[PDB]
Design an enzyme around this catalytic site. Structure first.
Site, PDB file in Angstrom:
ATOM      1  CB  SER A  42      -0.938   0.028   1.184  1.00 38.07           C
ATOM      2  OG  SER A  42      -1.923  -0.969   1.063  1.00 38.07           O
ATOM      3  CD  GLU A 140      -4.296  -2.554  -2.220  1.00 36.69           C
ATOM      4  OE1 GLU A 140      -4.307  -3.776  -1.971  1.00 36.69           O
ATOM      5  OE2 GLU A 140      -3.401  -1.787  -1.789  1.00 36.69           O
TER       6      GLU A 140
HETATM    7  C1  3Y6 Z   1     -11.282 -10.435  -1.081  1.00 34.91           C
HETATM    8  C2  3Y6 Z   1     -10.948 -10.373   0.395  1.00 34.91           C
HETATM    9  N1  3Y6 Z   1      -9.587  -9.942   0.585  1.00 34.91           N
HETATM   10  C3  3Y6 Z   1      -8.765 -10.739   0.418  1.00 34.91           C
HETATM   11  C4  3Y6 Z   1      -7.418 -10.548   0.559  1.00 34.91           C
HETATM   12  N2  3Y6 Z   1      -6.978  -9.167   0.957  1.00 34.91           N
HETATM   13  C5  3Y6 Z   1      -5.624  -8.752   1.156  1.00 34.91           C
HETATM   14  O1  3Y6 Z   1      -4.712  -9.517   0.991  1.00 34.91           O
HETATM   15  N3  3Y6 Z   1      -5.404  -7.421   1.541  1.00 34.91           N
HETATM   16  C6  3Y6 Z   1      -4.085  -6.962   1.716  1.00 34.91           C
HETATM   17  C7  3Y6 Z   1      -4.219  -5.457   1.797  1.00 34.91           C
HETATM   18  O2  3Y6 Z   1      -5.280  -4.896   1.592  1.00 34.91           O
HETATM   19  N4  3Y6 Z   1      -3.020  -4.726   2.121  1.00 34.91           N
HETATM   20  C8  3Y6 Z   1      -3.065  -3.307   2.211  1.00 34.91           C
HETATM   21  C9  3Y6 Z   1      -2.694  -2.874   3.613  1.00 34.91           C
HETATM   22  C10 3Y6 Z   1      -3.757  -2.764   4.733  1.00 34.91           C
HETATM   23  C11 3Y6 Z   1      -4.817  -1.858   4.653  1.00 34.91           C
HETATM   24  C12 3Y6 Z   1      -5.720  -1.779   5.710  1.00 34.91           C
HETATM   25  C13 3Y6 Z   1      -5.562  -2.577   6.836  1.00 34.91           C
HETATM   26  C14 3Y6 Z   1      -4.494  -3.459   6.915  1.00 34.91           C
HETATM   27  C15 3Y6 Z   1      -4.320  -4.327   8.147  1.00 34.91           C
HETATM   28  O3  3Y6 Z   1      -3.491  -5.266   8.135  1.00 34.91           O
HETATM   29  O4  3Y6 Z   1      -5.002  -4.096   9.181  1.00 34.91           O
HETATM   30  C16 3Y6 Z   1      -3.583  -3.552   5.868  1.00 34.91           C
HETATM   31  B1  3Y6 Z   1      -1.846  -2.841   1.236  1.00 34.91           B
HETATM   32  O5  3Y6 Z   1      -1.948  -3.206  -0.148  1.00 34.91           O
HETATM   33  O6  3Y6 Z   1      -0.531  -2.804   1.829  1.00 34.91           O
HETATM   34  C17 3Y6 Z   1      -3.366  -7.503   2.947  1.00 34.91           C
HETATM   35  C18 3Y6 Z   1      -2.377  -8.473   2.805  1.00 34.91           C
HETATM   36  C19 3Y6 Z   1      -1.710  -8.976   3.925  1.00 34.91           C
HETATM   37  C20 3Y6 Z   1      -2.024  -8.485   5.187  1.00 34.91           C
HETATM   38  O7  3Y6 Z   1      -1.350  -8.973   6.333  1.00 34.91           O
HETATM   39  C21 3Y6 Z   1      -2.998  -7.506   5.333  1.00 34.91           C
HETATM   40  C22 3Y6 Z   1      -3.664  -7.012   4.215  1.00 34.91           C
HETATM   41  C23 3Y6 Z   1      -8.177  -8.303   1.118  1.00 34.91           C
HETATM   42  O8  3Y6 Z   1      -8.007  -6.963   1.484  1.00 34.91           O
HETATM   43  C24 3Y6 Z   1      -9.406  -8.844   0.894  1.00 34.91           C
HETATM   44  O9  3Y6 Z   1     -10.492  -7.991   1.086  1.00 34.91           O
END
Ligand code: 3Y6
Length: 265
Positions: A42, A140
């Site tokens: 991100s 994403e």
């Molecule tokens: C279809 C359902 N699905 C499936 C997978 N997914 C996903 O992999 N997300 C990574 C992510 O958004 N990452 C964003 C970061 C993010 C954004 C908001 C919260 C958090 C959190 O960990 O609390 C992390 B970004 O692109 O760096 C992600 C990857 C690894 C992690 O340990 C956490 C999130 C989803 O978001 C998702 O909705």
């Protein structure tokens, strides 16, 4: 020296670590695996907002974007709560940076237009800043999930540091737009345990984090010393040895940042 300390952090956390701090008039560059590729995750949301700001008048920030529940396909702390009302472009920028909102990022990508749902346009914007290295190939959440070694959706600590330097300290954006990007990064809610945790309280830190599978944890920041001297700090990491489910380690980034802060003090 610094290289041995970074290498010990890699051993301690079973991780790969990348660091870049650009040279200044009075300090040398700090670099560790700085030209190796790491997944954006991100962290791309910060230059994404810069691309949208660059390409449009300020009034574009007040355009209302409507979306559906089915459009939410990634972690989206703000967008989850505004399906019924929509969100303005400005609110999407705020959310993308301060809460790392994935739907906000995808909608901003769409706003750039063009092939790949905006990903080609985003990459093009980076090229316009002299970054020939980074590439965005997916939106994403897919962009955070490529296997280690895959070049899709990667940057380098060096490359992203130089981009952030131009955006925040340079003249990539006119002052009024630059101030928006800077304010959003300054009020980020997701970074307290990363670069911020490595710099003493009398340093100002603005940042944008990234988190992904294979234990990916990134943070890019601009920091100001207690006397107002700025530095750009990019720290990227993964833990491929633990596979897809490997836990990201924020303390690795905090320790690396502490090393950097000691050298810069
Ligand atoms: C279809 C359902 N699905 C499936 C997978 N997914 C996903 O992999 N997300 C990574 C992510 O958004 N990452 C964003 C970061 C993010 C954004 C908001 C919260 C958090 C959190 O960990 O609390 C992390 B970004 O692109 O760096 C992600 C990857 C690894 C992690 O340990 C956490 C999130 C989803 O978001 C998702 O909705």
């Amino acid at each position: 020296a610094l290289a041995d300390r970074f290498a010990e952090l890699e051993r301690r956390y079973d991780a790969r670590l990348g660091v870049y701090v650009p040279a200044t008039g009075t300090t040398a560059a700090i670099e560790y695996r700085a030209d190796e590729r790491f997944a954006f995750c991100s962290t791309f949301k910060a230059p994404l907002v810069a691309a949208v700001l660059h390409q449009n008048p300020l009034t574009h920030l007040d355009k209302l974007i409507t979306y559906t529940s089915d459009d939410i396909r990634s972690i989206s702390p703000v967008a989850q709560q505004h399906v019924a009302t929509g969100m303005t472009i400005g609110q999407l920028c705020d959310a993308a940076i301060r809460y790392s909102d994935g739907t906000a990022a995808n909608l901003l990508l769409a706003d750039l237009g063009g092939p790949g749902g905006g990903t080609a346009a985003f990459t093009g914007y980076l090229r316009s800043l002299g970054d020939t290295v980074s590439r965005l190939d997916a939106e994403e959440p897919e962009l955070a999930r490529d296997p280690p070694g895959d070049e899709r959706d990667t940057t380098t600590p060096h490359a992203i540091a130089l981009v952030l330097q131009q955006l925040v300290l340079g003249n990539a954006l006119p002052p009024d737009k630059r101030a928006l990007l800077t304010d959003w990064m300054a009020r980020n809610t997701t970074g307290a345990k990363r670069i911020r945790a490595g710099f003493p309280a009398d340093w100002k830190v603005i940042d944008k984090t990234g988190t992904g599978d294979y234990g990916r944890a990134n943070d890019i920041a601009v920091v100001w010393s207690p006397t107002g001297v700025p530095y750009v700090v990019a720290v990227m990491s993964d833990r491929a040895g633990g596979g897809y489910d490997a836990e990201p380690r924020e303390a690795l980034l905090a320790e690396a940042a502490t090393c950097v802060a000691g050298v810069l003090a």
